[PDB]
A and B are shown apart, each in its own frame.
Chain A
Amino acid sequence: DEDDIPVRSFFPENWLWRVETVDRFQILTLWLPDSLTTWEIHGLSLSKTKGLCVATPVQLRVFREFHLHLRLPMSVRRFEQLELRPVLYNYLDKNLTVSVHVSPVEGLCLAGGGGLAQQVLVPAGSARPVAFSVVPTAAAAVSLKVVARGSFEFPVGDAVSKVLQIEKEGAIHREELVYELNPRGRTLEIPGNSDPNMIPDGDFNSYVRVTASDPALSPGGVASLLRLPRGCGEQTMIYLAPTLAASRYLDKTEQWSTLPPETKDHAVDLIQKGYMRIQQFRKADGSYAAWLSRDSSTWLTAFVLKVLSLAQEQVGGSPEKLQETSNWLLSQQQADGSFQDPCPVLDRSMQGGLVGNDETVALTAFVTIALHHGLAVFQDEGAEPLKQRVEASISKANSFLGEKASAGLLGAHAAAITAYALSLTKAPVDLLGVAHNNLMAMAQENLYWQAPALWIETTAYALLHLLLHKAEMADQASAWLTRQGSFQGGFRSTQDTVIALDALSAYWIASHTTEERGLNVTLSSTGRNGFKSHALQLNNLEEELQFSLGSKINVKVGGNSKGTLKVLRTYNVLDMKNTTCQDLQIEVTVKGHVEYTMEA
Chain B
Amino acid sequence: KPRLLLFSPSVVHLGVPLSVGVQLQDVPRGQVVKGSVFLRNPSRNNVPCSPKVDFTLSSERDFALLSLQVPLKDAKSCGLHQLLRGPEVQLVAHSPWLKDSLSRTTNIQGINLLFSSRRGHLFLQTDQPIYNPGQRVRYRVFALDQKMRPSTDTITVMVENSHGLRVRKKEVYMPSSIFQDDFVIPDISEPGTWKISARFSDGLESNSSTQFEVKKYVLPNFEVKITPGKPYILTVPGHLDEMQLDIQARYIYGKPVQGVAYVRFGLLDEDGKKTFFRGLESQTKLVNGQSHISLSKAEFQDALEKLNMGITDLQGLRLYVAAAIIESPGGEMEEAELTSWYFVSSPFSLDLSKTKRHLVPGAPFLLQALVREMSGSPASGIPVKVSATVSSPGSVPEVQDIQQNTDGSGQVSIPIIIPQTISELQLSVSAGSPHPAIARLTVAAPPSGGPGFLSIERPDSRPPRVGDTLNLNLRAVGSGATFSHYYYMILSRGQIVFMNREPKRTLTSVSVFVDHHLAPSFYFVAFYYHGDHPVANSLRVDVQAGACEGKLELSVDGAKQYRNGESVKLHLETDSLALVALGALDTALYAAGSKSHKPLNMGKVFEAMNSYDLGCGPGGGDSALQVFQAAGLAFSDGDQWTLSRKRLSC
Contacts and interface: CB of A to CB of B under 8 A. Distances in A.
Direct contact between A and B in the complex (CB less than 8 angstroms)? yes
Contacts of B91: 261
A91 B327 CA distance: 16
A447 interface: no
A251 B88 CA distance: 13
Contacts of B83: 254
Nearest to A538: B166
Contact of A44 (B219, B552, B589): B552
B602 A53 contact: yes
A261 B42 contact: yes
Given A13-B589, A24-B573, A129-B330, A56 B187 contact: no
Contact of A38 (B254, B551, B570): B254
Interface stretch (B28-36, B304-312, B466-474, B558-566): B558-566
B586 A13 contact: yes
Nearest to B144: A52
B84 A254 contact: yes
Given A85-B330, A129-B329, A60 B582 contact: no
A2 to B, nearest CB: 18
Given A30-B567, A62-B566, A43 B583 contact: yes
A56 B166 CA distance: 34
A186 B300 CA distance: 66
A42 B587 CA distance: 12
B552 A37 contact: no
A14 B216 contact: no
Contacts of B258: 126
Nearest to B255: A91
Interface in B543-602: 547-556, 559, 561-590, 599-602
B487 interface: no
Contacts of B138: 14, 17
A279 B570 CA distance: 83
A214 B32 CA distance: 57
A19 B331 contact: no
Nearest to A21: B579
A55 B556 CA distance: 14
Interface in A547-585: 570
Size bin of chain A's contact surface: 35 or more
A314 to B, nearest CB: 6
B55 to A, nearest CB: 18
Interface stretch (A137-145, A234-242, A265-273): A265-273
Nearest to B602: A54
A27 B569 CA distance: 6
A21 B577 CA distance: 7
Contacts of A256: 42-43, 88, 90
A476 interface: no
A407 interface: no
A58 B554 contact: yes
B404 interface: no
Nearest to B166: A543
B586 A44 contact: no
B583 A42 contact: yes
Interface in B231-252: 252
Contacts of A127: 327, 329-330
A385 interface: no
Nearest to B553: A55
B45 A54 contact: no
Contacts of B178: 19, 46
B563 A63 contact: yes
A22 B587 contact: no
A254 B578 contact: no
Query: Main SS of chain B's interface residues?
Result: loop
Contact of B554 (A42, A51, A85): A42
A35 to B, nearest CB: 7
Contacts of B90: 256-257, 261, 264
A513 B252 CA distance: 58
Contacts, number: 337
A53 B330 contact: no
Contacts of A23: 577
A116 interface: no
B375 interface: no
A46 B42 contact: no
Given A19-B579, A52-B144, A46 B85 contact: no
Contacts of B329: 87, 127-129
Task: Please indicate which of the listed interface residues B575, B580, B590 has the most CB atoms of chain A within 10 Å of its own CB.
Answer: B580
Interface in A92-134: 126-129
Contacts of A59: 587
Contacts of A313: 45
Interface string B38-78: 00001101100000000000000000000000000000000
A8 B565 contact: yes
A589 interface: no
B579 A543 contact: no
Interface string A424-438: 000000000000000
A516 interface: no
Interface stretch (A67-75, A175-183, A368-376, A491-499): A67-75
Given A24-B573, A28-B570, A38 B253 contact: yes
A41 B582 contact: yes
Identify the interface centre among A20, A46, A172: most chain B CB within 10 Å of its CB.
A46
Given A15-B584, A29-B567, A46-B150, A265 B46 contact: yes
Contact of A16 (B112, B575, B582, B588): B582
Contacts of B253: 36-38, 61-63
B163 to A, nearest CB: 8
A262 interface: yes
B330 A87 contact: yes
- Among A34, A43, A314, chain B packs the most CB atoms within 10 A around the CB of A43
B580 A542 contact: no
Contacts of B255: 63, 91
B565 A46 contact: no
B587 A46 contact: no
Contacts of B274: none
Nearest to B588: A37
Contacts of B125: 44
Contacts of B221: 69, 71
Nearest to B189: A207
A264 B553 contact: no
Given A30-B569, A513-B84, 4 more contacts: A38-B254, A44-B600, A45-B551, A51-B148
Kindly list the 8 A-B residue pairs having the minimum CB-CB distance in the complex, ordered from nearest. Answer: A53-B548, A47-B578, A16-B584, A261-B110, A256-B42, A45-B552, A22-B574, A51-B148
19 contacts: A14-B128, A19-B579, A21-B578, A22-B573, A29-B569, A41-B583, A44-B552, A45-B581, A47-B579, A50-B551, A50-B578, A56-B554, A57-B554, A63-B563, A87-B330, A251-B43, A257-B112, A264-B46, A265-B46
